[PDB]
Write a protein that binds this ligand. Structure first.
Ligand SMILES: NC(=O)C1=CN([C@@H]2O[C@H](COP(=O)(O)OP(=O)(O)OC[C@H]3O[C@@H](n4cnc5c(N)ncnc54)[C@H](OP(=O)(O)O)[C@@H]3O)[C@@H](O)[C@H]2O)C=CC1
Ligand SMILES: CC[C@@H](C)/C(=C\c1coc2nc(N)nc(N)c12)c1ccccc1OC
Length: 186
């Protein structure tokens, strides 16, 4: 099984969501980027796994439910089975990652991507070991009600570039944003 990775898009005031939707209007290529990063597996005959909280699952426009080409796992202590269209259900992040070692997934999974929400991000980021964060910096303030955790830069190093990730400023709908990759190993 491969790398552990978080991916997020976040505004200047640290916001990731407002009532189960994005703080900002739809950014079509930003979303294509998320799709490409999380889907693309190098290891042949494997798929990436995506791990999200229950809220995040239910915020997915149904058109993208499940996220195609990836194994979709939802985290919920309340649910008793994977939601309609999801593949797996775990009661915690540690369980999710363990499940990954079992024979049913042992060599189906390439990369695992945590795609939200706030408490999942915080736990993966605080989890010792080798981890990357793919962070789109939306370079405005947007009114939000859910927030990305603090990135501890003593631990997380911003990489000066990364294959397959544009290093320069993007703009959609008059909103500027840029793509960053942070890496820790502790
Ligand atoms: N990059 C971006 O801009 C992103 C934005 N979002 C947005 O934020 C929202 C979703 O984020 P958020 O509200 O933080 O919620 P989550 O997606 O984390 O969902 C929360 C629920 O999932 C369960 N859960 C969370 N963590 C764990 C865990 N470790 N183990 C077991 N269960 C867990 C709990 O469900 P239960 O009560 O059933 O146990 C919890 O109430 C949406 O608005 C979405 O649009 C989400 C991801 C990325
Ligand atoms: C897992 C859900 C994903 C489909 C999503 C957000 C992102 C999660 O990590 C992300 N990382 C990046 N770089 N961009 C994103 N957009 C997300 C999303 C959630 C609610 C409403 C609209 C959304 O996208 C239009």
């Amino acid at each position: 099984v491969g790398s552990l990775n978080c991916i997020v898009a976040v505004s200047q005031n640290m916001g990731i969501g407002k009532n189960g939707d994005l703080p900002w209007p739809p950014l079509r290529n930003e979303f294509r980027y998320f799709q490409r990063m999380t889907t693309t597996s190098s290891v042949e005959g494997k798929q990436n796994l995506v791990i999200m909280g229950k809220k995040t699952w239910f915020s997915i426009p149904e058109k993208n439910r499940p996220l195609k080409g990836r194994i979709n796992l939802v985290l919920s202590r309340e649910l008793k089975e994977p939601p309609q269209g999801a593949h797996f259900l775990s009661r915690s992040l540690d369980d999710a990652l363990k499940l990954t070692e079992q024979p049913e997934l042992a060599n189906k999974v390439d990369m695992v991507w945590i795609v939200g929400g706030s408490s999942v991000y915080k736990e993966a980021m605080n989890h010792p070991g080798h981890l990357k964060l793919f962070v789109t910096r939306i370079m405005q303030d947007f009114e939000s009600d859910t927030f990305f955790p603090e990135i501890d830069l003593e631990k997380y190093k911003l990489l000066p570039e990364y294959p397959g990730v544009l290093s320069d400023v993007q703009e959609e709908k008059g909103i500027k944003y840029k793509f960053e990759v942070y890496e820790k190993n502790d």
